[PDB]
């Protein structure tokens, strides 16, 4: 049977980048050129892999990570990058072997006057390790006195909303992002191309 790439790409709702979604693909066949052979995508960079040489390859697990960020933030979904997203939201390893795919979704994810659904972590104390996922909603302690759950001087709520307005320039519009990671362990590799 074919891999559920439909469920990941065409999903009706995408996650907030901070609580990015991870669908694990196992025991199935996948056509990765019927992906690259769509003009629908605005970014489709693959690092460590060739997008054609993919139906010729098997892996033990493939991972489909998806979330929404701003177009000016798509540059940070790449090995070796820094900024609110890459540092506090979703980091890719320096030795990443996978593909980052993204397409503009102004039509689905920005509502007139603001979509305050999608969020990003604005405050952290330390950068994320690769494929780490911080879902804390605890008040951020920027001082030396503790905060004990109340906004205030030195006490910041760590998640904020991308105020998606559909009129903005393309840089400040929502883009949907799917990161395909291909891992090879010493165990029966189950995700093959045809």
């Amino acid at each position, epitope marked *: 049977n074919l891999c559920p790439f439909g469920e990941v790409f065409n999903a009706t709702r995408f996650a907030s980048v901070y609580a990015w979604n991870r669908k694990r693909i196992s025991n199935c066949v996948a056509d990765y050129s019927v992906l690259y052979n769509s003009a629908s995508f605005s970014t489709f960079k693959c690092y460590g892999v060739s997008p054609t040489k993919l139906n010729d390859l098997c892996f033990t697990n493939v991972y489909a990570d998806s979330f929404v960020i701003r177009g000016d933030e798509v540059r940070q979904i790449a090995p070796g990058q*820094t900024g609110k997203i890459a540092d506090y939201n979703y980091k890719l390893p320096d030795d990443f072997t996978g593909c980052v795919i993204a397409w503009n979704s102004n039509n689905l994810d920005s509502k007139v*006057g603001g979509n305050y659904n999608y969020l990003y972590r604005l405050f952290r104390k*330390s950068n994320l390790k690769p494929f780490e996922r911080d879902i804390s909603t605890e008040i951020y302690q*920027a001082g030396s006195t503790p905060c004990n759950g109340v906004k205030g001087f030195n006490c910041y709520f760590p998640l904020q909303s991308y*105020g998606f307005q559909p009129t*903005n320039g393309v840089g400040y519009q929502p883009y949907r992002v799917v990161v395909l990671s291909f891992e090879l362990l010493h165990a029966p590799a189950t995700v093959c191309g045809p």
Partner: antibody
Amino acid sequence: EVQLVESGGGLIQPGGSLRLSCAASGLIVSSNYMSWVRQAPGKGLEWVSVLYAGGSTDYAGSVKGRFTISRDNSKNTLYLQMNSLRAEDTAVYYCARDAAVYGIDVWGQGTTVTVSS
Amino acid sequence: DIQMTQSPSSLSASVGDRVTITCRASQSISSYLNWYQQKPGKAPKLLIYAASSLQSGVPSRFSGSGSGTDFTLTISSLQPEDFATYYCQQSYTTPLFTFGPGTKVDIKR
């Protein structure tokens, strides 16, 4: 108390360098977006560079590859290393703690840097 | 990127008036807007954050409104120490913030 205490500017010839110093007390600079901001005579506030709590850095087009923001958490101090200085950089330099959505709420007193031959 | 414009540039007002400064972004930046006061020789004081939130210790006469592209700093009764220069700054692209050009409020005569 809550304060940023700057020091370290003055006269310098073009091509020389300085090292500005923002002594923090009342917030932790390692837990914060700490920015440097400069204001040319009569000209308003221009952002110069950032120190992310996690340690990443950004710089303004002009200073990129000549200035270097850094910190020392033992002394709780933000630093700006201005090398290959030019006469354009002549301004007052503030240090501030950027609380983003909440504002830039803590500014240092400013130190003045004059670059002239 | 987002440039910022300020309407009056220079504004003349007297003690006790209701003064209104304007700010505007090249893009819709939600309520990601902050107001500052500055006087000659001193540093900026944060007045309004998040477009409406009055900052700790700033007198209650300082209202802030707006959202999207256009914003307004209102002073309900101008005081003698209020004569200064007021900037807006945008947080949308934080930590790379851009400021407004300023509005100077001088003493009418």
